[PDB]
Amino acid sequence: KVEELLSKNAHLENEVARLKKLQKQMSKKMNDQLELMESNIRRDIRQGFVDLQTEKSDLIDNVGAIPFLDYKHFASRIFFPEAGTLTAVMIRVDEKCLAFAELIRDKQFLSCFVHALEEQKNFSIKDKCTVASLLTLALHGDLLYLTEIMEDLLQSLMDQSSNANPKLLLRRTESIVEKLLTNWMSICLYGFLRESVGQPLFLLVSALTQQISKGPVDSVTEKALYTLSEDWLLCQAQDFEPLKLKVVFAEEISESLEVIALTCDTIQQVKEKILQTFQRKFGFRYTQQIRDIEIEYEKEFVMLQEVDDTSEIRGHVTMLNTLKHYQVGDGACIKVITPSVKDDKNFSIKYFHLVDPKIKEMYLIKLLSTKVAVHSFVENLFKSIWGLPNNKAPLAVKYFFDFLDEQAERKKITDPDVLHIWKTNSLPLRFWVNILKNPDFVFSDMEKSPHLDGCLSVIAQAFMDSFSLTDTHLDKHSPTNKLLYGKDIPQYKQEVKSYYKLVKDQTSISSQELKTFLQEESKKHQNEFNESAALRELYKYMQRYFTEIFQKLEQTDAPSNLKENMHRVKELFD
Amino acid sequence: EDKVEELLSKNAHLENEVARLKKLQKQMSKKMNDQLELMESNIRRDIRQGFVDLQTEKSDLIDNVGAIPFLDYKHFASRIFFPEAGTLTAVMIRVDEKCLAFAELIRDKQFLSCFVHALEEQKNFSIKDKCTVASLLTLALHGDLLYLTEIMEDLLQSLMDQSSANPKLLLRRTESIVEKLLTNWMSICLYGFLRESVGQPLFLLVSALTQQISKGPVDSVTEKALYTLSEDWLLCQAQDFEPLKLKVVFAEISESLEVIALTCDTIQQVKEKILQTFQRKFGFRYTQQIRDIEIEYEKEFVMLQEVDDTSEIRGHVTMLNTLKHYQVGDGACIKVITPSVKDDKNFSIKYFHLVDKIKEMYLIKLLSTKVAVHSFVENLFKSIWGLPNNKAPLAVKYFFDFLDEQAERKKITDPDVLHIWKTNSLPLRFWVNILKNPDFVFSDMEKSPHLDGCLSVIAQAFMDSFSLTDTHLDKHSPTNKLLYGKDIPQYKQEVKSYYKLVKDQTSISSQELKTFLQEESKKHQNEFNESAALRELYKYMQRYFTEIFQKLEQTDAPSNLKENMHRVKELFD
């Protein structure tokens, strides 16, 4: 048994030797790894600083004519932004409808109708917005009458019970008159939108798209290097270098084009950068549908795809194919002719790009760096929103603001903060904010990404804060989203106070001019929507609360012919 | 056969080693993984903090002073004429026959002309000598600036038409006598405008740079700090600290005042900050001499100094007493009445403050500083190239019109050349020296080397404003150029305008010119003794006597003149 002792002893000696060596190896390895990470930290921090200090201004991308959506779809997204079971038919039988439409146009009927429906516990906000939008559809050919009824309704909404504090009015769209007012603002402001606000909004979108496209984007988390929102910022680092490709379009025709991509871009992302560079350099899409262009690399002429038979696999997730993967260098000929992975249901839990299983803050500069680069387009858009084209505000605004003036007067109020509260609560917060946050509603072929929605959310949060009436003091404890535009807000606050004041000072609106305009806008889209389906869906509510409506109608000394009309519509639809 | 014993014993020992080894290894592994974690967190906490600071900088640099403490013109000129040795300056600051002879001599245009030219035609004559005699001449003729202007101008006409190679390389640097002459002339003629428009914004910029650096930790040793404008002065290692709102009182009669110091300041630094916060607050200093104010702390009444019996010691170097060392809390009352270690020759090699690794981490601070002070800088600059009531200072309008005139006589149809001369003679000759040396202009101006580094950044930017080359900024640049880089192009435009606007201003009437120059002559007539100056100048005259006489003969000089020249050498000898 001394044999086993000699074997175990020799082994013990030898194992001590190994452990001793292993300790030293792992020590040196650790120290080296440390040096590496440190060097990378320095390099990336400095590179970030340098980027901030040296950002060229290349977001200058010409467009000319702007691809607005048809008014029907804009309105469709602004009236009903949830379901579209009726929108389709309302975009693209006469006796009962005529009866309901004749009925509706009677002021006291519509009044007692709305008032009755809003006098129900059984009546929710969704119903309210529904019937309000149906009303607008029904009376879009008669905006003047619509306006009048809305005014009477608003007067009621003030004088009635909201006297607890005049500042808590129109905070949010809950009543029928509120939804009504929103929709109204969309209608009467659509023109001014296309004239003044449309273009700079597009350019802000164009630019934002582009500036993010200068830096690496995880195709999975949808996170990137350039952003305005700290949540979308990339955690882990990324080693990469840009490529100046020479993409050509095609005994075949010639059409060269310099396109800038990266060594870490997925094929699809490169197709994006090329369609984008195209529409930004020329003003028109090469192909409207992104799923038509064949992309081909010339090795010595090989077609390239999202994934091929040579993709790395780690654990349970596959790595996408970048550009380094196909060994692509600087000045590589790329062909685009005329002949998806993301279409898969399970895409985010099967594919891998730039994150796997951590100094995020070293990229904070990028926020600033992005924020500066895009700032120009912002102040434009913003100053186009609260602007006075030829010292004149849009008629809708001037009228409605003068109305608020009148009503504040009629309530006997001596505190401008209130009028400011109404004014902000009825225009920038009901309408403009909803546009800045959703530009796809306005423009044709406007595919809007979640990240872009995040950044636009930051820009809009700052837009709202422009109208604040409270002196926010920025300190170490504040959202990063608020610390980006912080220094700029107190300016906007002053321009906003201005905008309101100058409007109040602008001359009154001639009733002849208001009527002319409103009837003009009625004419522009009279036959765009069918009153048919709207009145039809509206009567559903009418008969749902018929008894109540009738009772309220009695409560205000109504004529015979009117009640007879009501029962007549009921007896025609039934 | 007892081997079984040994093999066991040995194995025991061996196995034990293995055990320990593993444990050791294991523990060490953990340590590393923890170390990482810590540094990671620390890094974030600083990076973010820096970012946050850039986004939250309040404007508290608003510190009043009122009337500015200028230096007597005597010392200003003393430092702008001789910026090196002051063995002669002190004599001029605070024989009748011979001196009057020399003074009457110099006032002849032909003698002084031939003097200068001959002197400038000698290889034995160094630059330092040329500047020396130029300054001596200026001192000697300060009461007669009209004559001085005249001789200077004729000398310039000479230096210009004598070259006949490229007009863009005139007035580049100070090497001929005419050039140092030109500089000194500028100082005299513009000291007025200095006090007028450039005095205040410069002093306020110094006050501002002073305050902003005082906001963060400053290594008392390497003189490096957290808030700076040059990457070089930026701190390396992190420092851990919180601010302190001290209730400083002045003694028992009393007087209260809030001060903001740090939990990592040397006592001396705290003294600096109380004096500075005071003078920024009231407009005057409680004490001019900084070594008369006693600093006392109250714990139960206890005095505190630079080092005590309980100072930490590592390796072979001592650590200074911070405010944390004496356990000073937020709101600690500090007594100040009327009754250093930095004075020790071997100071920097014996002590320790904040160094004993990621520096780029603090690049934000440069910005954070650069932004914070920008206000003041744009003042100073836009004061320098500004036009008070649409009128450039007489001196400037005059000399610039002179340069136009001369350029026109050379048939030069190139605007770039006029621009080159104009920048080469005014902003680079005079203004830069003042940005980089505000202590020449101000009473009691302690200028730290760091402050000099920063001013060197700002001055480099200033200089870059007058440049005629479009600079494209890329990743390969200094940090100092990267800071103000996006600001330079606007300036270059303001400068081109300024030169155009000076030119388009109405000319200067000879009556107004003479009035001005004689007025400025009569102001400072008695501030310097012509005696010692002429005395030191005659040294130069007799050194190169024969050559002067030769240049004189070669220019049809009259008898009475040469007779005078020999007469003077007769008097001094």
Numbering used by the authors:
A (entry chain B): 531 to 622, 633 to 790, 795 to 844, 847 to 885, 896 to 913, 929 to 1145
B (entry chain A): 529 to 622, 633 to 702, 704 to 790, 796 to 844, 847 to 885, 896 to 912, 929 to 1145
Direct quotes from the study:
Plexins are a large group of type I transmembrane proteins that serve as the major receptors for semaphorins. The plexin cytoplasmic region contains a juxtamembrane segment, a RhoGTPase binding domain (RBD) and a GTPase activating protein (GAP) domain. Instead it is active specifically to the Ras homolog Rap, and this RapGAP activity is critical for plexin signaling. Semaphorin binding to the plexin extracellular region induces formation of the active dimer of the cytoplasmic region, which triggers its GAP activity to inactivate Rap through the non-canonical catalytic mechanism for signal transduction.
We therefore removed the linker and directly fused the coiled-coil with the juxtamembrane helix (the N-terminal helix in the juxtamembrane segment) of plexincyto. In the CC(a)PlexinC1cyto structure, the two plexin monomers in the asymmetric unit form a symmetric side-by-side dimer. The two juxtamembrane helices are oriented approximately in parallel, extending well beyond the main body of the proteins and integrating into the C-termini of the coiled-coil moiety. The dimer interface is formed by the juxtamembrane helix and one side of the GAP domain, burying a total of ∼3200 Å2 surface area. The center of the dimer interface is a 4-helix bundle structure comprised of the C-terminal portion of the juxtamembrane helix (residues 567–584) and the N-terminal portion of helix 11 in the GAP domain (residues 929–943) from each monomer. The core of the 4-helix bundle is dominated by hydrophobic interactions, involving residues Ile571, Ile575, Phe579 and Leu582 from the juxtamembrane helix and Met933, Ile936 and Leu939 from helix 11. A loop-helix segment (residues 1038–1058) between helix 15 and 17 in the GAP domain of each monomer wraps around the C-terminal portion of the 4-helix bundle. In the active dimer structure, the last two turns in the juxtamembrane helix (residues 585–591, corresponding to residues 1282–1288 in mouse PlexinA3) convert to an extended loop. In contrast, the activation segment in the active dimer adopts an open conformation and shifts away from the GAP active site. Therefore, a major mechanism in the dimerization-induced activation of plexin appears to be the outward shift of the activation segment, which opens the otherwise obstructed active site to allow Rap binding and catalysis of GTP hydrolysis.
